[PDB]
Amino acid sequence: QTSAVQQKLAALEKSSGGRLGVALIDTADNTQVLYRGDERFPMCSTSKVMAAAAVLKQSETQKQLLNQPVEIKPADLVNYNPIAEKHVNGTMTLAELSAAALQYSDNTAMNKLIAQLGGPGGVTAFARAIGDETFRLDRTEPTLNTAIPGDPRDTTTPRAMAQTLRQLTLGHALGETQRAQLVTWLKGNTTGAASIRAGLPTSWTAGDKTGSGDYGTTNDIAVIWPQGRAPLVLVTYFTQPQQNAESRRDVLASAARIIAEGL
Numbered sequence: 013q014t015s016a017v018q019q020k021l022a023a024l025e026k027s028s029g030g031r032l033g034v035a036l037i038d039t040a041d042n043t044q045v046l047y048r049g050d051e052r053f054p055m056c057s058t059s060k061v062m063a064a065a066a067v068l069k070q071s072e073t074q075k076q077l078l079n080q081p082v083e084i085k086p087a088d089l090v091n092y093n094p095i096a097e098k099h100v101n102g103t104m105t106l107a108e109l110s111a112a113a114l115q116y117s118d119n120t121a122m123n124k125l126i127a128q129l130g131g132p133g134g135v136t137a138f139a140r141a142i143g144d145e146t147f148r149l150d151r152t153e154p155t156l157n158t159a160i161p162g163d164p165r166d167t168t169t170p171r172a173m174a175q176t177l178r179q180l181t182l183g184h185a186l187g188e189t190q191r192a193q194l195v196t197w198l199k200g201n202t203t204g205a206a207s208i209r210a211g212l213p214t215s216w217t218a219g220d221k222t223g224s225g226d227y228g229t230t231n232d233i234a235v236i237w238p239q240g241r242a243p244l245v246l247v248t249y250f251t252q253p254q255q256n257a258e259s260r261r262d263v264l265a266s267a268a269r270i271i272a273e274g275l
């Protein structure tokens with residue numbers, strides 16, 4: 013079956029020239045609204061949520077883990093490191109690295125989270141431990157952003173990421189303290205105002221993590237608190253056929269608007 017909302021999303025996709033993936037979970041009734049929900053998309057920086065969450069899980073059995081210093085060396089700097097570059101030849105704690113990765117999309121910070129987990133497979137292993145059989149992280153920053161069409165590396169599906177984001181932020185995949193910390197970090201994101209949030213009524217609140225890569229890959233995953241109703245989880249993935257395609261955050265905003273108007 014094709015709903016009115018799915019038809020609107022297909023029309024948006026057609027006009028955009030790219031490939032759009034959407035998954036909504038409305039926690040009022042647990043109903044789902046999917047568009048290419050089982051197709052794979054490159055996650056790009058949206059994978060930072062899984063890495064931060066995996067470190068939060070580790071911290072449940074180590075009260076001091078988040079205060080643990082990690083050395084930042086000149087050689088650790090990658091392609092986008094607005095926070096880590098300030099701390100080169102010094103240290104950042106795992107909490108500081110998590111906050112930098114989530115709220116500023118700092119790529120050096122992400123690489124330190126990955127290293128703490130023993131490599132990209134450590135992030136995948138955490139995903140499996142919380143019931144996500146779809147997520148895969150194969151590479152570090154910045155190569156996890158190559159976003160080559162048909163490449164399964166560093167991909168997930170909208171359905172899988174929406175389910176996982178729900179379990180992490182609203183469910184019991186993490187301890188209560190850790191879930192709260194994750195929600196706090198997402199709510200303080202600095203990079204999200206042009207993406208999912210731009211399509212939502214201004215009265216609503218949300219936390220999100222954006223992503224961008226090659227092939228004009230433009231992503232956002234959000235937990236949303238709409239005025240006067242139960243929270244939503246929304247993931248919007250978008251990727252384009254040319255390697256050097258421009259970002260299209262407006263497409264994500266449009267998808268979010270269609271979803272909101274369909275409630």
Ligand SMILES: *[B]([O])([O])C1=C(/[C]=[C]/C([O])=O)C2=[C][C]=[C][C]=C2S1
Pocket residue numbers: 055056057058091092116117119153154157203222223224225
């Ligand atoms: B992530 O791996 O998508 C990367 C981001 C940030 C994504 C976002 O949505 O802010 C950047 C930003 C600048 C240069 C490289 C990367 S990788």
